[PDB]
RNA sequence: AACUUGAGUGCAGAAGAGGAAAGUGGAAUUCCAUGUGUAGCGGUGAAAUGCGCAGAGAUAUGGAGGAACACCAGUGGCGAAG
């Protein structure tokens, strides 16, 4: 009544940062079920950054999706770290049925000033 | 004193991020407001300060302001250089 949306369509965030990946999981209209993050399972300091820990992570927000009622998402994967494509392959070979990968990587148009180079 | 080649004006054309002033646009960063949602986020080689149970990060819809103009974009162009 207030967090089983049955609902057969979704999509799933991967924010896959170089230290992080937190795998969101939701509807259509972006009101979220449930996420895991890397960091949620443990994992500490470049553990997070390993792909077992992003693959994990799309594991147990998967479980979590379809206690809440998912059956086909759609992905949306963000980030310049090593677990995006490890992640979309673990949310598909734990039962849910992804289907696009919209890339969505902020890009700007020469916006606001990057941070300085280490 | 003539001449027209140098130089300059005319006529017919040509391209350009050349300059100044004003306006408009979209993406992105940050902040604020709201909806969803739970325990981390961020960081490093390693961890800690920092933020977060007053509900942060993640995601969605906005609003605010400021700065710079992805692709085009090229040993391309323009300017005396900057």
């Known amino acids: 009544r207030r967090v089983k949306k049955?609902?057969?369509n979704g999509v799933a965030?991967?924010?896959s940062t170089f230290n992080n990946t937190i795998?969101?999981?939701?509807?259509?209209?972006g009101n979220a079920l449930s996420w895991s993050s890397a960091?949620?399972?443990g994992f500490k300091g470049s553990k997070k950054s390993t792909p077992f820990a992003a693959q994990?992570?799309?594991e147990t927000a998967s479980k979590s999706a379809m206690?809440?009622?998912?059956?086909?998402?759609?992905v949306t994967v963000k980030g310049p770290g090593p677990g995006?494509?490890?992640a979309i392959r673990a949310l598909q070979s734990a039962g849910l049925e992804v289907t696009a990968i919209r890339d969505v990587t902020?890009?700007?148009?020469?916006?606001?000033?990057?941070?300085?180079?280490?």
């Open 67 to 74: 206690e809440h009622g998912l059956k086909t998402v759609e």
């Open 23 to 29: 795998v969101t999981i939701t509807d259509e209209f």
């Open 39 to 41: 960091g949620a399972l």
């Open 13 to 15: 965030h991967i924010r």
């Open 106 to 118: 902020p890009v700007p148009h020469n916006g606001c000033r990057p941070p300085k180079r280490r």
């Open 6 to 8: 049955n609902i057969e």
């Open 84 to 86: 995006r494509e490890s």
């Open 56 to 58: 994990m992570a799309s």
